Amino acid sequence: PDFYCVKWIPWKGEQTPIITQSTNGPCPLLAIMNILFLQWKVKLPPQKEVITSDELMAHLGNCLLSIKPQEGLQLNFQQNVDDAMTVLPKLATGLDVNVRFTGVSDFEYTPECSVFDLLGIPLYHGWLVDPQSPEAVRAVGKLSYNQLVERIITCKHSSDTNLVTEGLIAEQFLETTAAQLTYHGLCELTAAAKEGELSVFFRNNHFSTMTKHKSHLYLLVTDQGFLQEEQVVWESLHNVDGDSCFCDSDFHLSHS
Ligand SMILES: [Hg+2]
């Protein structure tokens, strides 16, 4: 959380910085910031090696406050900026994220969602309930995750056996989809993402910087272990869980 290592890479033919972490924390700061660095919206002095949160925060503050309104939600805009600013300091420490299983862009709104929306950064997750299993669909339905854990507990202590049944139908779905990415999710997520756009991907209380390229998904390699490995930049998100290929800045294969 204190200091982060900067990694310089040849992004779109220009030396561009990227921020690394070994810690694997639940801070979306780096996910958001790396997107901004990749879009050249923040620039660092060429020599830079290490960076603090307070700099990144500063850079982010300026970035949000420098957004000119450009066509739609008017009184919302000004509240969203104020919402973004009030929650801005939380982005360093960590964040509760309550997904919904109804679609890849679906969360319970908290004001931290304003920062993504202001900056035009999509937030996605892959924890989707399958249409194929329609008992789980019925049991989960409208509910978000933290609502589903409440209802599961409520369903245990019900005397009605219908509810107690569904309380297990749902408790199954979380047990079977424990790694928070279903195959149905990965398909829907791929189709959803705009080719060559940067976005943030949520899974197991981690935020990753994501993009789509030749209609395949890749995540940025935040890992500090590959700090020296300039040729290791993107990692494929082709399978639901397992083996994955690494790529350089231009999406060509690479090895260590
Ligand atoms: Hg959020």
Numbering used by the authors: 111 to 181, 185 to 369
From the publication, what sentences describe this entry?
Here we report the discovery of a new family of DUBs, which we have named MINDY (motif interacting with Ub-containing novel DUB family). Found in all eukaryotes, MINDY-family DUBs are highly selective at cleaving K48-linked polyUb, a signal that targets proteins for degradation. Our structural analyses reveal that the catalytic domain of FAM63A is a distinct folding variant of the superfamily of cysteine proteases. Collectively, our analysis of human MINDY-1 reveals that it is a chain-trimming enzyme, which uses the Ub-binding MIU together with the catalytic domain to cleave K48-linked polyUb chains from the distal end in a stepwise manner.
In order to determine the mechanism of this newly identified DUB, we crystallized the minimal catalytic domain of FAM63A/MINDY-1 spanning residues 110–384 (MINDY-1cat). The structure of MINDY-1cat domain was determined at 3 Å resolution by X-ray crystallography. The asymmetric unit (ASU) contains one molecule of MINDY-1cat with discernible electron density for residues 110–370. The catalytic core domain of MINDY-1 with a dimension of 32 × 64 × 36 Å resembles a light bulb consisting of two subdomains, a central “bulb” subdomain that sits on a “stalk” subdomain, which resembles the base of the bulb. The core of the central bulb subdomain contains a seven-stranded β sheet (β4–β10), where β7 is connected to β8 by a short 310-helix. The stalk subdomain, made up of three α helices (α5–α7), forms a long helical arm that protrudes away from the central domain. We predict the conserved C137 at the N terminus of helix α1 and H319 on the adjacent β6 to be the catalytic residues and these are present in a C-H architecture typical of papain-like peptidases. The third catalytic residue, which serves to polarize the catalytic His, is not obvious in the observed crystal structure. However, in the structure of isolated MINDY-1cat, the active site is in an unproductive conformation and C137 is rotated out of hydrogen bond distance from the other catalytic residues. Therefore, the observed structure is MINDY-1 in an inhibited state.
